């Protein structure tokens, strides 16, 4: 029969999320995701010196502020007509990249891993579900724990890598319109490289291994969470000063079918979100944000984005799928050793397994390796002492748009200037693509979809409802702003 479970708050995510599932036959058959907290940076930002945006918009999210600083300056760059010094471009990628590493380590170890690992006997790691489904050996579980404790210092270090050229973290001071505010010295490029090597080693040696190690005990989890099996990437970490080659190149994948990315095919629906009916369906350049907290039928503060009517998903999997890069070394081994599988590029994981609860966790562990390579490649490219910033003039009237990939997926800021002050600012952020409610056609958000068919053998212990959600790395602050 049909029993309704409600999980509010979903813990070990970032932000306020309620998930609602209805269960018949021991499987999820309908879901509803609610974003329960709203601030409205999209109106707060109106009227300000455009250069304030590069600080305000980081306070959207405390985990991924450099993705916001980055999206923001990119837009301002366009709107001001600024030319970012080549050596500034790299410095920016070094500030942002170091937090991808920090974000992804943070997610697995400190947010997800407890899905699969019993921490110690001290709060907050108990009290927890009696029938939790923690299948690791006393040994593997004590190894799971030892590393969590270790990630506490690895991720703390990544924030010192960020802070060397960004100034601080969370909330960098270093990224501005025109580039980066501090030129890398030889001295500090060592400081960064020293720490980078400690991190390089942990990711290669501990994090990537243990995701497969744990994964192979939970092989049933690659069979659920497929959702619409559609992915989005919009490009990130520019490699040239022209805007052509990027670390992640853009692209869409929907219905076995690859296509190009067209930002003008973006519209945000609000039928089921607490925003004024008269704003639904617009594109970011014409956006408005009018909260309607008493609207009947709405059930989330997160808008409902669709790309040409599609409900897509974003993030590591979505990025690693579109680009299909060559799999890491440590990953090709343990796929052979533990899964008995042979793959050399990403898509050799196939649509079903890649697009699975445990396939996204892995994309995120594989994408991190990919970043070890990007950062090592930039520490060669950076040249100490060469100028990073230009000091542009505020346009009276201008418009710009910044596209990038936050750790959790596609992010963009759009800005409209008037009389030299912000007249409109709009944000389409990663967790907005995953955690959104239904659109106006009743089409479910990508995660709402992913939840269908999830095993809830144990209505008392619906631990998998929350395991699926966590695999997406949600930030409901980034979703709502």
């Amino acid at each position: 029969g049909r029993t309704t479970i409600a999980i509010d708050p979903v813990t070990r995510i970032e932000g306020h999320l309620k998930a609602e599932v209805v269960v018949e036959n021991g499987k999820v058959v309908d879901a509803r995701l609610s974003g329960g907290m709203y601030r409205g940076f999209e109106t707060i930002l109106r009227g300000r010196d455009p250069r304030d945006a590069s600080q305000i918009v980081q306070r959207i999210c405390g985990v991924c502020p450099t993705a916001h600083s980055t999206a923001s300056v990119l837009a301002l760059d366009e709107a001001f007509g600024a030319k970012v010094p080549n050596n500034g471009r790299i410095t920016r990628n070094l500030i942002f990249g170091a937090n991808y590493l920090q974000s992804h380590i943070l997610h697995f170890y400190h947010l997800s891993a407890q899905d699969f690992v019993q921490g110690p006997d001290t709060a907050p790691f108990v009290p927890r579900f009696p029938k939790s489904d923690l299948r690791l050996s006393k040994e593997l579980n004590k190894a799971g724990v030892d590393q969590y404790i270790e990630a506490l210092e690895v991720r703390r270090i990544c924030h010192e890598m960020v802070a060397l050229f960004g100034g601080r973290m969370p909330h960098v001071q270093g990224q501005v319109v025109g580039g980066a505010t501090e030129i890398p010295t030889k001295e500090k490029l060592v400081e960064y490289a020293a720490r980078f090597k400690k991190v390089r080693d942990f990711v290669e040696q501990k994090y990537v291994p243990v995701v497969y190690t744990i994964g192979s005990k939970y092989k049933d989890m690659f069979k659920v969470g497929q959702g619409f099996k559609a992915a989005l990437c919009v490009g990130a970490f520019p490699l040239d000063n022209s805007g052509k080659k990027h670390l992640f190149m853009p692209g869409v994948y929907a219905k076995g079918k690859d296509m190009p990315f067209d930002p003008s095919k973006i519209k945000e629906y609000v039928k089921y979100s607490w925003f004024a009916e008269e704003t639904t369906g617009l594109n970011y350049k014409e956006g408005k944000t009018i909260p309607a907290p008493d609207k009947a039928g709405a059930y989330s503060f997160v808008k409902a984005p669709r790309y040409d009517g599609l409900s897509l998903e974003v993030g590591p999997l979505a990025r690693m799928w579109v680009n299909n890069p060559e799999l890491s070394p440590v990953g090709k081994k343990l796929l052979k050793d533990l899964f008995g599988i042979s793959a050399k590029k990403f898509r050799d994981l196939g649509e079903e397994a890649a697009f699975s609860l445990m396939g996204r966790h892995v994309a995120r562990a594989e994408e991190t390796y990919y970043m070890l390579g990007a950062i090592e490649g930039w520490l060669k490219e950076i040249k100490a002492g060469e100028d990073t910033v230009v000091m542009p003039a505020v346009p009276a009237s201008a418009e710009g748009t910044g596209f990038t990939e936050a750790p959790r997926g596609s992010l963009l800021h759009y800005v409209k200037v008037k009389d030299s002050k912000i007249d409109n600012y709009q944000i389409v952020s990663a967790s907005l693509w995953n955690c959104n409610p239904r659109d106006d056609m009743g089409q479910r958000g990508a995660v709402e979809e992913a939840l269908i068919g999830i095993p809830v053998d144990d209505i008392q212990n619906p631990v998998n409802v929350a395991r699926l959600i966590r695999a997406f790395d949600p930030x409901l602050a980034c979703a709502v702003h």
Partner: protein, 277 residues
């Protein structure tokens, strides 16, 4: 180890993240040897109505002995709908509802971040949520629970960890309401502990000479001059960042670009524009 509840409202999860960067003690030592963290929606194992129930239990167990941490401001408008935190017994809980339930029965209340302490960004010019600072919310609902503000956007881990200790040690020495009186005594007028916010940035800036010479930087990357013309707000900010610096000491805001006075009650509106004198 005394029991701690960590409740987020209109926060960006920044307060929590900066605390994970506490070096000595590392966050792990804080959690296992200093405090019993009983509820924190971001790090804790259990979830949902279970996760709330465990809190009300501990809250009812240790009435007058649990410590209540608030990150983010409290949006009172729309009956509290702009910030729902949970559901238990099929009724949904606003931050307003929660701060009422638990605020009164706490040893003390730690408002962390500039959002919680002073209201900050969700309370700024252009907001329509009625975002309210903790201390103001409580008084306006009759609650007399002591409140300690540890502001910042985000606060430096040491300002937090620092504040917890000097209150437990104020409680060890003199018992509870005795320590709490000592704790309230080391506060300036803005509810901040003077150990951390008792000195001004400017008055201790190492570029103060460049300030007095009138040599200013024209581009950010020019680390020679004073930053006032680029928009540094050190002159009107009260914080010890010049000493301890950020992220294990690897940089800080004036050295890197500018100070935006994130610790001050008027942040952000009173400190904007950030990048003009």
């Amino acid at each position: 180890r005394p029991p701690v509840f960590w409740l987020q409202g209109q926060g960006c999860t920044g307060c929590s993240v900066t605390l994970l960067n506490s070096v000595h003690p590392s966050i792990a030592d804080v959690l296992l040897k200093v405090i019993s963290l009983e509820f924190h929606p971001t790090v804790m194992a259990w979830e949902g109505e279970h996760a709330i129930e465990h809190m009300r239990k501990v809250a009812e167990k240790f009435k007058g002995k649990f410590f209540l941490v608030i990150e983010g401001s409290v949006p009172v408008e729309a009956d509290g709908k702009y910030c729902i935190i949970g559901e238990a017994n099929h009724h949904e809980i606003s931050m307003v509802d929660a701060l009422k339930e638990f605020g009164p029965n706490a040893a003390a209340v730690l408002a962390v971040g500039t959002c919680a302490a002073y209201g900050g960004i969700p309370a700024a010019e252009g907001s329509e949520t009625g975002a309210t600072a903790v201390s103001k919310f409580l008084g306006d609902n009759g609650i007399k629970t002591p409140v300690v503000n540890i502001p910042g956007c985000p606060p430096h881990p040491d300002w937090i960890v620092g504040t917890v200790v000097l209150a437990l040690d104020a409680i060890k020495k003199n018992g509870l309401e005795g320590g709490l009186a000592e704790v309230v005594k080391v506060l300036d007028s803005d509810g901040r502990p003077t150990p951390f916010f008792g000195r001004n940035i400017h008055e201790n800036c190492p570029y103060l000479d460049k300030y007095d010479e009138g040599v200013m930087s024209a581009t950010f990357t020019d680390k020679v001059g004073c930053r006032y013309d680029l928009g540094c707000k050190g002159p009107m900010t009260m914080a010890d960042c010049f000493e301890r610096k950020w992220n294990g000491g690897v940089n800080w805001c004036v050295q890197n670009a500018v100070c935006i006075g994130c610790v001050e009650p008027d942040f952000p509106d009173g400190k904007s524009p950030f990048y003009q004198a």
